[PDB]
Each structure stands twice: as C-alpha cells, then as structure tokens.
Symmetry: C6
Amino acid sequence: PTYTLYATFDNIGGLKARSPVSIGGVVVGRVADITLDPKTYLPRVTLEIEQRYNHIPDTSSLSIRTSGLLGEQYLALNVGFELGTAILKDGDTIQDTKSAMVLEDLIGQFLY
Amino acid sequence: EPTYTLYATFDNIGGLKARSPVSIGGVVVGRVADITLDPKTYLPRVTLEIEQRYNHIPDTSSLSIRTSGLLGEQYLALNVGFEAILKDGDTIQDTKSAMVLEDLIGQFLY
Amino acid sequence: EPTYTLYATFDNIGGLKARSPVSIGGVVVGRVADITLDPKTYLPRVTLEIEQRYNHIPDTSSLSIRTSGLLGEQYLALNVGFEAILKDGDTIQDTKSAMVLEDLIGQFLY
Amino acid sequence: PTYTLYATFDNIGGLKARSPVSIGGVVVGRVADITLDPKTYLPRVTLEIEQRYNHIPDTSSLSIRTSGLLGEQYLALNVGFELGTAILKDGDTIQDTKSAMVLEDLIGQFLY
Amino acid sequence: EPTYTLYATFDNIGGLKARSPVSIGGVVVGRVADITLDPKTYLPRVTLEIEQRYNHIPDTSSLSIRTSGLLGEQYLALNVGFEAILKDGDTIQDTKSAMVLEDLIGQFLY
Amino acid sequence: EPTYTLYATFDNIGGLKARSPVSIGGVVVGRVADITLDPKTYLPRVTLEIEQRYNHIPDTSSLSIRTSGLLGEQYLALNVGFEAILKDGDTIQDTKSAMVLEDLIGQFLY
Ligand SMILES: [Zn+2]
Ligand SMILES: [Zn+2]
Ligand SMILES: [Zn+2]
Ligand SMILES: [Zn+2]
Ligand SMILES: [Zn+2]
Ligand SMILES: [Zn+2]
Ligand SMILES: [Zn+2]
Ligand SMILES: [Zn+2]
Ligand SMILES: [Zn+2]
Ligand SMILES: [Zn+2]
Ligand SMILES: [Zn+2]
Ligand SMILES: [Zn+2]
C-alpha cells in the first residue's frame, strides 16, 4: 500500500489531484488531496507515498516544479539529511516546503 | 454551490472571461460571474462569486490577474490581506491589472 | 449588434484580419469590419464597427494593435482618452502599429 | 489579373510557393516561384502582384519575415520612395532585398 | 537487437523514462532499459542497453541527460572518452544530471 | 531524381535523420541518404545525395546543421564556398555541428 504525508504551501500553482510526487525525477508517490486550511487559508497538500520508500527523513524538502517548459506541475521530494533526525511515518508532515513560482513575479524580477 | 458576490474594477482584464477561476494560493475558491465596462468610467468591472465557506476574507485583500503556466488560461489570484471582512456585495479596492506583451517588450527594450 | 463605423489608418496592421475584436481594457466592445489599403497612400485603412452603447468615446482616444498571450491572435486595443465625441464615420488619428518580430530582434541584438 | 516581379535573396528560409506578399501586413500578392539561379546559386523568387497595385516604385524593399513567433514566413513589401524614380512593371526586378534571419546566427550574435 | 547492459547513477534523471534513446553524437546507439532508485542511496540508477556492435566505448566516457529541441523529449547523450573498455554489466561513473527549469530561472534571476 | 553522393562527418548531428533536406539559401537541393557512426572514430558520418544538376559546388563549401523556425525540423544548410569542384563520392571537410540546448544554457548562464 502507501503511507500519508502532509505539506503546506503558500501557493501550489498548477498542482492538482493525482499529481506525481517524485524523487530525483522518479515517481515515488502521488498527490492525494489539496485543501485550504480553514484558519490559515494556506493550501494543504495530502500526499501518498509508496510504502517501500521508508527511510525518508523529516529534514527532506518538497519543491513544486514543472516538467519541461510548458508541461504539467509536480512535487519534487528532495531527500533530507540524516543532529537528531526522525524518519517520516504515516500521517507525518514535511515542514520544509518551497512554493510554486509565479510568472508575473518572475517577470517583475527580471524587469524591475 | 452557495456563493456571495464581490466586485473588482481593473484598468485591463486581459484574457479574463466568464467562468474564469478565482484562486487562493492556486486553489480555486470562486468564479468570475460577470465582466462589464462601467458606464461612467469605461473601466472593466469584474463581478465575482465566491464560495460561501470562504467568508473570512478581509477587505485589505488584493486581486491580481495572472496566467497559468506560460501559455495557459488567465485567472484571478486573490492575495489574502493581513489581519473588516468582505461580505456579499462588497468591493475589493486593491487590484492589479493584466500584463501586456507590447508593454513588457516596451519596458525590456526601451 | 447595433454599431457605428470608425476608420483608423496604420503603417502596419500585422496579424489583424476581418472579425478581429476591438477591445477596451480587454473587454470586447467592437469588431474589425474591414481592412483595406488606401488607394492613394498605400497605407492600411482599418474600418471598425463599435457597439452603439459605447458612444462616449472621445476623439483623443488611441488604437494599439496587440497580441493575446504570447502566440495568440492579434487585436485592436482602444485606449479611451481624457476629455469632442466620436460619431459614425469618424476617423481615429492617433494609432500605434503592430510590432515586427524581426525588428524587435534587430533592436534586442543591435 | 496580376503582374510579375523578381527578387533575389541570399537565403529565403521558410519561404515556399503560394507564400503571401504583403504591404503593411495586407496581402497584395503571392510567391509564384522560387528557383536557384544556375550561375550564382542564389534563390530567385518570382512573385505575382495584384494588378490594381500599380504605383509601386523600384526603390521599394522586400523583407522576408515571420508571422507571430512560430508562424509561417512571408514577404513584406516596404513601399519605396518617390531623384529619378521608376514604377515597377510586369517582369521587373526589386533590387533592394533583405534575407531571412537564421536562428543559429541570431544565437551566435546574442551569445558571442 | 543484440545488446550489452550498462548502469549509470544520476542525482536527477528529469524526464528520462523507459525506452528513452541513448545516443552518441546524436546517433541512437542504445536505449534506456530501466530506471530505478537504488534502495540504499535513494539515487536514480539507470539501466541501459547498448547495441553490441558499439563495443569499443572506454570507461572514461560520460553520460549527460539532454533535451531534443526546446520542448522535445529527454535523452541520454553518451560522450565517448579518449583512451579499459566497457563490458556487459559495467557502470559508468561519470554522469551529468538533468537541468531543472526552476534552478535555471533561479540562476538567471539571482 | 539523378543524384551524386557526398560525405560529411560531424561531432553531433542532433535531430538529423534520414531524408532530412539539404538546402542552399533555404532552397532544398538534396537529401540525407544515410547516417552512420564511423567504426574507428565513433563520429557521425552523414551520407548525402545531391541532385545532379547542382554540379558546380566547390570543396570549400560548408555544411551547418540548423533548425527550421524555432521549433521546426532539423536540416543541413550548405554554405556555398568561394571560387576544386565536388564530385560523386567526395567529402566536405568544413562542417558545423548541431547546437545543444544544455550547452547554450551553459554558455549563457556560466
Ligand atoms: Zn494514511
Ligand atoms: Zn538510517
Ligand atoms: Zn450575491
Ligand atoms: Zn478575524
Ligand atoms: Zn455605419
Ligand atoms: Zn463627455
Ligand atoms: Zn507576367
Ligand atoms: Zn506617382
Ligand atoms: Zn545484459
Ligand atoms: Zn582501444
Ligand atoms: Zn552515388
Ligand atoms: Zn567554376
């Protein structure tokens, strides 16, 4: 089966349900759900990771990225370091997350 | 399906159309109900319908017209303001218009 | 579609064609009725039809040919000037032409 | 009917038969033929212009351009000035011509 | 398709998939047989099959993940090193990973 | 349909394939008959067939692999040399390889 993880972002961009979660480009999981937290109004992503990937630290990072230039958006799981480190279990939360870039802001940067 | 109405005036709506999605942090929370030029000012007035369960939106919140991906569809990004709450029929004052390719090129070049 | 006719001469119309939309602030308020080179000046004269309900457009208003998105179709942006009102058969003197990629590249490089 | 004009380029790029010839973006003619001159190995373009466009000077220019960013290639006819000036007739040649840009050279410029 | 097996570990395979082409100087000489994360290191290990007639590839050779055109599919470019020959079951140590757009933009901007 | 054969070795042919067009000044004058890695050098050897009526091509001429438009197909541009003539079976020494996106990005960035 699979085990559940939670990750909150400021902006998920083009992320949707059944979006792939990948390590080093290799798909190891899928985005199960996306829901705005009622108090913080921040996108909370519920992901399901294949059970055979057990040794993922809680220091690991999630970055929302895009395949190619115009392709679909996905979650890149950067394997964390192993200082007391704890492995991610079912129902745990990945604290270190990077949000999706916004074209207008990137242009805002490049121009101004 | 229950919703409350909000109004937002822009200088340029760009590719915005009816049923365009209104999203917070990329998550769709509403839809563009109508778009109409104000009879007096000739400025685009956008009429939005927001899902009722998203009630706690301050009036300090911002609206920015953006594009999904590089070539995708145009949408309204609702930037949540810091913490008066917006009710049915209220107006969001702080709005950002849609980018214009010619103007961006005009900026980059000249 | 009750409309009134307007004329606008450009140096270059670019991708403009018949039935091209004329928009104010992104809101379509009219259509490109015809495009024809003036017999005397060999400059593109564009014949536009604007919806009758948008009457209060001053003659100080401008027309700029722009593109929807990056690769989309070309359209006429009518910039409403500040304030004589434009009537049926009048001519918009102030026009901005369509950009040419080769020239943009020529600029960017040289 | 139509009248014929000839224009030699160094490189025609994506130009082909039945390609549009336009003034100020308005199509006024079509590319009838393209053939390499046997001695000079330069692309010679034979164009046909609608008869009703009579007052085109021989000082006019032809530039091969592209519609949009990825669209098809066409001939932009820049109306010449009217100094003894002669109008273009059937079988005449447009001397002032600009060739089609090459992506590799443009990149070569931008980089080096 | 008589072939011999090779292994190559990357930090990121990007768009690489099964049946992805392995090419020398643009000429396809093999195929990506499999891709699997090493159980111990959690790093992508790519299993390649190279056509038997290309035997004289030294072990100093390099693998770089590249893209055909601008938007095309991703492939493995095998750069033949100058001159021990690679056999069936060997491992290419020298590998260059697939670029990430976000990082490229991050570089270009910052 | 009559043709004479020419050979050209590159470091990288890129997207070149069989039946790729060989053009002078954009005008197609020949086709890529075959592509094969040299057994000794592991370098792409391109076998071209040129229409017989284009006989007067000097051996000082150059071959450059280019792309049609921005996203179009890959082709061989034959740059006519200044004024020994190339015959059937001769080899063009001066060749330019196909650009690599990663290398161009590598150049632009680093
Ligand atoms: Zn669970
Ligand atoms: Zn451990
Ligand atoms: Zn309401
Ligand atoms: Zn409150
Ligand atoms: Zn009328
Ligand atoms: Zn008035
Ligand atoms: Zn004739
Ligand atoms: Zn005259
Ligand atoms: Zn094997
Ligand atoms: Zn050896
Ligand atoms: Zn032969
Ligand atoms: Zn000679």
